[PDB]
């Protein structure tokens, strides 16, 4: 059971382009290395065995090479269905997997569309107050979110979550939720989420108070 | 065509038991060694159990050896994994995989296992209301376990839509879903989030109302 170090963890590539992944074994594995493609909601699919032998039916734009401890996997002419997580497997000594490489699509930088939402009738009638904010359809992946209430920032009681690359526009999205007991909602008036992206000096600011559009 | 279909996944309390099944078709099942492999929430693939084609030989990693038992019924083209004394680190998607040679060459689509002491809880579903386009959504709060499904207008709305991954804490899940529709057709024309939580036998329809 040998250690495989796969790198990089993630890549961005453009349609028609070309990508390369490496696997390094902790000891010589005698070219017994296979490569798998794994898409969300399906089972893995075998691409290559014995370092470079294509599985029948697999397009020729996939290839592999290496010997001893050092191996690589490549895609020529990247097609949109090639977006997936790729894994290596050594099978010289028992069997062991690499950690994986998430392959995503390159795209033109785009700013988030930001939308503010106050808590609803349902929630306050039940003892809670949740304010939510969406940062939708932006690129690249990384963004930051700061919540502002009564002119000052609040940084506790907030959890955030990221979409994967949207398969529709190659953009990402992010959701930010600040959740309070329902009696610090009616305490204050002013609530603000600002989204800072590499696409702009100044953050995109959305806010509401005691009557909402 | 070669086909592998896993089944039997579900939610089990720590220390519990559960038997997974895998149905084979499209090839001579009794000629093939078979394994179970799992994908953990951190997206690592983990070899879990191995059995040779005639069932003579068996192998388990130390992380499961003694608690899991792999077996097969060649006349019924079925592979099984009996798990027992289950622990939270066992939570994963479990795959069936064929080994003509030592590398795997076909996989099933998977069956999901969750090991948790948390109690099954239905969600609270809250509307989210705030230009030539409007962005609405719904908040799905305080549920267990995964998954929930969210559709808009009975699935009839379908590009302003994407749903964010649930976040766990204080042993309940929360997620939200977003919808973008032409400002002309809302609030002129109603938009509703349909939410379904199969484990608690819940379906809920929440109308989005303006201000």
């Amino acid at each position: 059971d040998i250690q495989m170090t796969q790198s990089p963890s993630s890549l961005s590539a453009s349609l028609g382009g070309r990508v390369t992944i490496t696997c390094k074994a902790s000891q010589d594995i005698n070219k017994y290395l296979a490569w798998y493609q794994h898409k969300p909601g399906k089972g893995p699919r075998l691409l290559i065995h014995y370092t470079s032998t294509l599985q029948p039916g697999i397009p020729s734009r996939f290839s592999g090479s290496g010997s001893g401890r050092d191996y690589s996997f490549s895609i020529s002419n990247l097609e949109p269905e090639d977006v997936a997580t790729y894994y290596c497997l050594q099978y010289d000594s028992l069997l062991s997997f690499g950690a994986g490489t998430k392959l995503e699509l390159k795209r033109a930088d785009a700013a988030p569309t930001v939308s503010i939402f106050p808590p609803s009738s349902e929630q306050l009638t039940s003892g809670g107050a949740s304010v939510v904010c969406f940062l939708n359809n932006f690129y690249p992946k990384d963004i930051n979110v700061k919540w502002k209430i009564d002119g000052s920032e609040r940084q506790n009681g907030v959890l955030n979550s990221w979409t994967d690359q949207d398969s529709k526009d190659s953009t990402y999205s992010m959701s930010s939720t600040l959740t309070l007991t329902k009696d610090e909602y009616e305490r204050h008036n002013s609530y603000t989420c600002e989204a800072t992206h590499k696409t702009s000096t100044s953050p995109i600011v959305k806010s509401f108070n005691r009557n909402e559009c | 065509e070669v086909q592998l279909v896993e089944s039997g996944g579900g939610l089990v309390k720590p220390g519990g038991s559960l038997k997974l099944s895998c149905t084979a078709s499209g090839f001579a099942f009794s000629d093939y060694d078979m394994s179970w492999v799992r994908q953990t929430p951190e997206k690592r693939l983990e070899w879990v159990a191995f059995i040779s084609n005639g069932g003579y030989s068996t192998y388990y990693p130390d992380t499961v050896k003694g608690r899991f038992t792999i077996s097969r019924d060649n006349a019924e083209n079925t592979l099984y994994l009996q798990m027992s004394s289950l622990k939270s680190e066992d939570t994963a998607i479990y795959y069936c995989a064929r080994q003509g040679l030592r590398y795997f060459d076909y996989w099933g689509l998977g069956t999901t296992l969750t090991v948790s002491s948390a109690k099954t809880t239905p969600p609270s579903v809250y509307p989210l209301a705030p230009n030539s386009m409007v962005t609405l959504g719904c908040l799905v709060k305080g549920y267990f376990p995964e998954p929930v499904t969210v559709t808009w207008n009975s699935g009839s709305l379908s590009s302003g839509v994407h749903t964010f991954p649930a976040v766990l804490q204080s042993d309940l899940y929360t997620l939200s879903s977003s919808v973008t529709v032409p400002s002309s057709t809302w609030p002129s024309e109603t938009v509703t989030c349909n939410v379904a939580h199969p484990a608690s036998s819940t379906k809920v329809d929440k109308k989005i109302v303006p201000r």
Binding site: S93, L94 | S52
Partner: peptide, 21 residues
Amino acid sequence: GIVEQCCTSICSLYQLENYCN
């Protein structure tokens, strides 16, 4: 597996080698 293949019959030394770690 190896028990189904090399237990009723003698397997070559090349064949056995393919089963090694």
